[PDB]
Amino acid sequence: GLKAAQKTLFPLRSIDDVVRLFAAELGREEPDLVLLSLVLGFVEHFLAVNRVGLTYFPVADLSIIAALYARFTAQIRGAVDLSLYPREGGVSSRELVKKVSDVIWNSLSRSYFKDRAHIQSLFSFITGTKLDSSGVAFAVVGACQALGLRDVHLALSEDHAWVVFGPNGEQTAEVTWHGKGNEDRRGQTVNAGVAERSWLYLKGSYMRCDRKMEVAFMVCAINPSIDLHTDSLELLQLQQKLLWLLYDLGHLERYPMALGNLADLEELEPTPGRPDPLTLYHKGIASAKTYYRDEHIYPYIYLAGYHCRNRNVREALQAWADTATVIQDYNYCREDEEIYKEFFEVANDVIPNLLKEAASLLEAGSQGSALQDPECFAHLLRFYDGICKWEEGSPTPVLHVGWATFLVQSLGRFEGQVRQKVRIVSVPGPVLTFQSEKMKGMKELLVATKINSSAIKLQLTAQSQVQMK
């Protein structure tokens, strides 16, 4: 049941009234995830999905929100009989967590597009019987909270979600699917994935949320997109304000991606008196270094994207080199395709486009150009080195000849006299050490006035032979 004190701010008539509700809930012992997600989903539906009749803000009446809450609590209480699953010691059992996951899963529409916008919240679950993959995990945690299961909490990697629970919160369970066409592991631990050093499970350096971080998750999960060309200004403002509320209370400290989201929002529309986007991206990286062993990729990707948008080639290259320095200590495994796609895009599309423009501007007489800076050439080489090291020891390869044409083109954007300045030093001006055997063998080829394209291709793909005839 909603408690009397949870109801006093209704009706919610504005963005600021929604912020007041979040502030009130975050001031409580246990913020009510079900209430909060139903409110966000309600307001997102009427600001992004269907804006017919909108004049300012979709007023959220208690009668409407309370009826949605009742549908959820009735579905969960009726379908999960806690007496079947006695709790030793204030903690939940694997079978109980599996039962709640089954209840959510079985409620979903038989057939729908899982990749759509606006199917993340409990409002989508109730009104449309549709959830995306992490939406199911969040719904399991919200259902568990509604049931009194204080130990069940959301776990997050950079591309997946599951739950932690049990004695000392040390158990893991899969509760949702990952990707498309992968085999389901619902009910199992994540230990095989941690042990194989995949990106998907972050070598165990994943987020273990408390209830406040679960609030931050649902706020990050707001989707302002109305269509491909249009965002809801109202939802952008709501998300931004809610993220600052969380930040001020300390609840983004251990949430690198939320800090990057907040930085991106500040870049779009700065809040007076607040830290610059750059400061916020760096806070996100600092969060990953402090709490997650610097084993997260996306803090650096957020930073590089900012530099790329501002056509700051030097700083973008630096940030992508730093991204690669993280990935080098992973094994590239079968469900890590999203981060492969990110690195492929950066190497084979984004960097080429940046350097093409830089080349034209150099022709027109630019000073201080990245293309005349040997430290920038070094960043490019460190980016490729990290990708090559990533591949070493991995069950599936990364590089192939499709990468080679772009490597040769990108190297060629720097004149030989610039390339010559980098000193490649072994273990045991600009200096660089390579970690990968591929780049060590390429060293020779990196300072010739005209790059030997064929030799580069052979070294990058460890294709051994050239054409017979």
Side-chain angles (χ1 to χ4, degrees), residues 1-87 89-109 111-114 117-179 181-227 229-449 451-466:
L2 283 163
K3 292 142 153 267
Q6 299 182 274
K7 298 178 183 190
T8 70
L9 295 163
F10 288 86
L12 311 177
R13 301 183 171 281
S14 64
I15 290 164
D16 288 346
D17 286 350
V18 175
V19 178
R20 284 179 195 83
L21 177 61
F22 274 78
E25 285 292 319
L26 286 161
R28 293 172 77 81
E29 44 279 3
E30 279 256 333
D32 188 325
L33 298 178
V34 172
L35 174 62
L36 294 172
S37 175
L38 289 170
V39 165
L40 287 183
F42 173 86
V43 303
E44 177 166 322
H45 179 82
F46 287 111
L47 286 162
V49 174
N50 183 358
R51 297 173 63 94
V52 172
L54 182 65
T55 63
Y56 175 62
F57 185 85
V59 174
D61 297 299
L62 180 63
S63 63
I64 295 297
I65 299 298
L68 285 162
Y69 189 99
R71 286 184 66 182
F72 188 76
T73 61
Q75 280 171 37
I76 300 303
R77 292 175 200 163
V80 185
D81 182 355
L82 290 178
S83 75
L84 300 178
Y85 308 91
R87 285 182 81 232
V91 303
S92 303
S93 66
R94 187 169 296 277
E95 296 83 1
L96 177 53
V97 167
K98 184 64 161 52
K99 179 60 175 173
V100 174
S101 171
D102 286 352
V103 167
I104 300 299
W105 176 284
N106 285 339
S107 301
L108 303 172
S109 292
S111 181
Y112 62 100
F113 296 72
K114 303 311 200 299
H118 316 299
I119 60 168
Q120 75 284 55
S121 65
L122 292 184
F123 180 92
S124 180
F125 178 73
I126 293 295
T127 64
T129 66
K130 288 183 275 296
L131 287 172
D132 61 20
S133 45
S134 59
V136 168
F138 175 85
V140 169
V141 175
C144 286
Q145 179 189 46
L147 288 165
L149 310 179
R150 294 185 78 164
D151 61 311
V152 177
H153 285 292
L154 191 59
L156 301 168
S157 69
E158 291 187 304
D159 198 42
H160 192 39
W162 61 96
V163 304
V164 293
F165 69 95
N168 307 307
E170 67 195 354
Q171 293 305 313
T172 58
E174 297 274 8
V175 296
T176 189
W177 66 97
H178 177 245
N182 300 314
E183 201 174 64
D184 185 288
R185 290 191 287 284
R186 288 193 310 116
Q188 297 178 40
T189 73
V190 302
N191 294 319
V194 172
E196 66 181 1
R197 306 168 68 81
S198 61
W199 172 72
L200 189 53
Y201 299 94
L202 298 172
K203 290 180 284 172
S205 295
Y206 52 81
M207 297 177 56
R208 298 174 93 102
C209 292
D210 70 359
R211 285 277 183 255
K212 318 285 196 310
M213 291 168 69
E214 292 149 3
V215 179
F217 174 83
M218 77 176 86
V219 172
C220 290
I222 294 164
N223 190 345
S225 287
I226 291 161
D227 67 25
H229 317 286
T230 317
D231 287 342
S232 166
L233 295 180
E234 307 91 340
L235 288 168
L236 286 164
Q237 179 191 136
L238 179 57
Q239 181 182 54
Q240 187 171 12
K241 286 174 171 180
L242 289 174
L243 288 172
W244 280 118
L245 172 63
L246 289 156
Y247 179 96
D248 285 347
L249 290 171
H251 303 311
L252 304 186
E253 179 70 8
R254 305 188 182 224
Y255 202 156
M257 283 179 314
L259 292 160
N261 195 163
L262 182 53
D264 284 355
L265 287 163
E266 284 301 307
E267 181 194 5
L268 184 62
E269 180 96 348
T271 308
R274 284 296 187 172
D276 305 317
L278 265 174
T279 303
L280 290 163
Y281 296 113
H282 286 280
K283 289 179 178 298
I285 289 160
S287 178
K289 289 176 178 292
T290 296
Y291 299 107
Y292 304 106
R293 305 196 304 182
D294 204 8
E295 287 181 313
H296 293 192
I297 304 295
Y298 282 131
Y300 298 103
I301 295 299
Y302 273 106
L303 173 64
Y306 176 81
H307 289 306
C308 181
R309 289 184 296 274
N310 292 288
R311 320 293 294 185
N312 193 332
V313 174
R314 172 182 295 98
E315 296 305 327
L317 291 168
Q318 180 163 246
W320 284 311
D322 288 343
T323 309
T325 290
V326 180
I327 207 64
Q328 77 179 337
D329 294 310
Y330 279 94
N331 289 336
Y332 180 49
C333 302
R334 179 170 175 296
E335 287 198 47
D336 289 351
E337 300 69 42
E338 291 297 317
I339 211 68
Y340 175 92
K341 286 182 193 165
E342 185 75 38
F343 279 109
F344 188 96
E345 190 169 315
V346 170
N348 302 315
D349 185 64
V350 185
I351 288 171
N353 282 345
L354 280 178
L355 301 178
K356 179 186 178 170
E357 182 170 355
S360 294
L361 291 174
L362 188 61
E363 180 187 322
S366 68
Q367 300 298 298
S369 179
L371 301 177
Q372 293 191 319
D373 180 356
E375 293 287 12
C376 289
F377 181 61
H379 297 325
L380 182 65
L381 300 179
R382 183 162 59 94
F383 170 76
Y384 277 89
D385 185 53
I387 296 168
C388 291
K389 179 66 175 168
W390 182 30
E391 181 176 65
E392 295 184 9
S394 298
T396 151
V398 172
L399 294 162
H400 58 68
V401 68
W403 291 72
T405 288
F406 295 108
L407 174 57
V408 169
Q409 175 191 50
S410 296
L411 295 172
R413 291 287 189 199
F414 298 77
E415 271 175 2
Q417 293 168 19
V418 177
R419 297 187 274 105
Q420 282 177 237
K421 295 201 177 71
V422 183
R423 178 83 166 162
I424 298 162
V425 306
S426 327
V427 174
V431 292
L432 178 58
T433 289
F434 286 138
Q435 298 299 313
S436 77
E437 295 302 320
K438 284 186 177 174
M439 299 299 289
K440 290 168 190 187
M442 220 190 267
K443 169 223 168 90
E444 50 193 81
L445 300 176
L446 296 173
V447 301
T449 289
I451 298 299
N452 185 338
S453 175
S454 297
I456 299 290
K457 294 181 191 170
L458 290 171
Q459 185 59 22
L460 187 72
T461 70
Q463 162 188 148
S464 167
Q465 287 156 124
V466 285

